[PDB]
Design a protein around this ligand. Sequence first.
Ligand SMILES: *[C@@H]1O[C@H](CO)[C@@H](O[C@@H]2O[C@H](CO)[C@@H](O[C@@H]3O[C@H](CO)[C@@H](O)[C@H](O)[C@@H]3O)[C@H](O)[C@H]2NC(C)=O)[C@H](O)[C@H]1NC(C)=O
Ligand SMILES: *[C@@H]1O[C@H](CO)[C@@H](O[C@@H]2O[C@H](CO)[C@@H](O)[C@H](O)[C@H]2NC(C)=O)[C@H](O)[C@H]1NC(C)=O
Ligand SMILES: *[C@@H]1O[C@H](CO)[C@@H](O[C@@H]2O[C@H](CO)[C@@H](O)[C@H](O)[C@H]2NC(C)=O)[C@H](O)[C@H]1NC(C)=O
Ligand SMILES: *[C@@H]1O[C@H](CO)[C@@H](O)[C@H](O)[C@H]1NC(C)=O
Ligand SMILES: *[C@@H]1O[C@H](CO)[C@@H](O)[C@H](O)[C@H]1NC(C)=O
Lengths: 194, 97, 49, 244
Amino acid sequence: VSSTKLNDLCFTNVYADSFVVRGDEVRQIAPGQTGVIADYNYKLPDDFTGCVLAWNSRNQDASTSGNFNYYYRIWRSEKLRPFERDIAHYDYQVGTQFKSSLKNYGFYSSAGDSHQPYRVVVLSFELLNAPATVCGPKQSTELIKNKCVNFNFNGLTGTGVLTDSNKKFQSFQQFGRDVSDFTDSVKDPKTLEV
Amino acid sequence: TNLCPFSEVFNATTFASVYAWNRKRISNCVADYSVLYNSTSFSTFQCYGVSSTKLNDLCFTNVYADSFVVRGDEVRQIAPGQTGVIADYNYKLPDDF
Amino acid sequence: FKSSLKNYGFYSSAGDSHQPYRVVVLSFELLNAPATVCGPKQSTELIKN
Amino acid sequence: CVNITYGSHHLYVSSRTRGVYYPDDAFRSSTNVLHEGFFLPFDSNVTWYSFWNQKYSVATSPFGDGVYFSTIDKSNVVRGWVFGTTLDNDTQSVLLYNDGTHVRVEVCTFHFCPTPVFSASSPHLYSSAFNCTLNYTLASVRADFTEVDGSFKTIREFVFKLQDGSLNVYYASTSYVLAIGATSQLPSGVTPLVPLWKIPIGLNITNFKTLVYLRSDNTPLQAAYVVGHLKRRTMMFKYDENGT
Ligand SMILES: *[C@@H]1O[C@H](CO)[C@@H](O[C@@H]2O[C@H](CO)[C@@H](O[C@@H]3O[C@H](CO)[C@@H](O)[C@H](O)[C@@H]3O)[C@H](O)[C@H]2NC(C)=O)[C@H](O)[C@H]1NC(C)=O
Ligand SMILES: *[C@@H]1O[C@H](CO)[C@@H](O[C@@H]2O[C@H](CO)[C@@H](O)[C@H](O)[C@H]2NC(C)=O)[C@H](O)[C@H]1NC(C)=O
Ligand SMILES: *[C@@H]1O[C@H](CO)[C@@H](O[C@@H]2O[C@H](CO)[C@@H](O)[C@H](O)[C@H]2NC(C)=O)[C@H](O)[C@H]1NC(C)=O
Ligand SMILES: *[C@@H]1O[C@H](CO)[C@@H](O)[C@H](O)[C@H]1NC(C)=O
Ligand SMILES: *[C@@H]1O[C@H](CO)[C@@H](O)[C@H](O)[C@H]1NC(C)=O
């Protein structure tokens, strides 16, 4: 989805994933990335539909003495699958010694941006033929019937003539399509009229 | 079964200057980069012509390792089709790299 | 006349943009020839027919 | 917890044309659509479990690439399932069950009892639960714990699949009259299972176990459930004009 179009779209479901990483590991929060975070902590699907937002959180997560409340995994017998979470505490063997698979970050307010804490929020968007629950701040206009108009219904845009429909829709159906995949009908989100 | 000697390279006491960059042939070894995560935080890990996620499933006839030191803001120039002091007069990658 | 070579001045107090970065470029050759560098994949048993 | 000493009785039956579910969320009308994915193969060998006053048949089953699950009962004996890897306290597990009034999902590190079961509406699933990342109600569905006499009257079918950290649940309910002595057999015909729930569990699932309710005396009731495994196959689906 283009970021410039988010204000014109509506989403059936929106999920917000939130965590803290080091500045130089924000690049790994993206599809097809390889690294300690992308492999053993948080993996996105290659067909991901959504937005990754990140910002320097030095003022809230770094301290002069150091903040050691944030942890990341260093080793997992296998790589994580998309949206998989592993919260188990286990040790791994390095040579003859057993070490914790979890390591602590040391966030110091005097460190460079690459070692500052970054708060990351991943917005996963679902766009299905279902009731809209999350929409952009677009103002609705008046319904114009029996004329060629550009239309925008819950993010779905197009050009055509809007007329009263005798078609009946299922409880959560928002739009109807034909064999050609042409949207031949829509439920008005304000009047619930097809 | 022998691990590729990446740890001894990444940890050489001194690397080469970018104008006099070093080339090392890597052969007869297993390339496992996850072993390096404990000692090396890769700010940049970008692959061209091959996906990084597929490297663990692939085998290579020849592997060359070019090593040098640059300033942080000049790491972007180590990539095909880049223009800059490093890309123009120190180290250039081929466009089909 | 000036030297075509300039010296970097790497200070531990500088910002990340002026910190030294070690770069390693791995050039891969994939031809119809003996493999010498492979990933850590376990081999299975050969299944024929 | 409840110590169950009753033995286990199981047999092998045919899957027939059961386990068909909507492969996508795209509206398809009056069209024959081909689909390559994980489906229950037609006429496949599936495991049928039967329970009676002297037989309690619940075992840990592999999840694999997905599971077709059906219950043929008359007294709501199957209350839900446990999904996970070790199904113990070294990992998180998914507990999906009906508490009597609501279908609930809990994702925590549960130390489940050797045989997690409900004693006449009374829960005895896990000794302790911690590290809960998910705990919410999926739907309001009244399922009684009463004992109904007579033949089985309904088959409830479920398809469980894992996709991007989410457990996808497909469901269909069809009236299926089966006498207690009648041969163990699934109904004939295609009944498409509709997408019911997409639960964001974020967990790796390799094994699952069925949860049942016993009588106030901890004796097993009369019920049957079937387990089949989804396999990679191409299937052709016929959609009507409604999209069914
Ligand atoms: C999902 O959970 C399963 C169940 O624990 C995980 O399976 C386990 O994976 C490890 C690593 O792949 C297996 O260990 C390996 O076994 C082979 C064969 O013995 C050995 O050559 C390797 O050196 C290593 O020890 C382990 O056997 C396996 N356990 C079981 C019971 O399947 C699986 O990795 C998890 N998937 C994730 C976290 O993505
Ligand atoms: C959204 O709100 C509008 C009102 O702003 C609802 O429409 C009005 O409903 C009242 C009561 O039925 C009617 O008298 C008005 O004529 C309607 N239109 C206007 C312009 O006021 C509308 O039903 C609401 N939609 C939903 C889905 O709740
Ligand atoms: C379904 O699979 C089971 C095995 O899981 C088959 O059962 C075995 O069949 C052989 C051959 O008849 C018997 O000798 C074994 O004693 C059976 N084992 C068990 C556990 O019953 C069964 O035949 C299969 N059914 C089919 C293929 O229709
Ligand atoms: C990483 O692990 C290797 C192998 O055990 C060890 O030689 C090396 O010193 C470790 N590096 C750090 C920074 O712990
Ligand atoms: C889930 O929430 C319900 C309602 O608060 C509670 O009774 C139950 O114990 C919780 N389960 C776990 C394992 O946290």
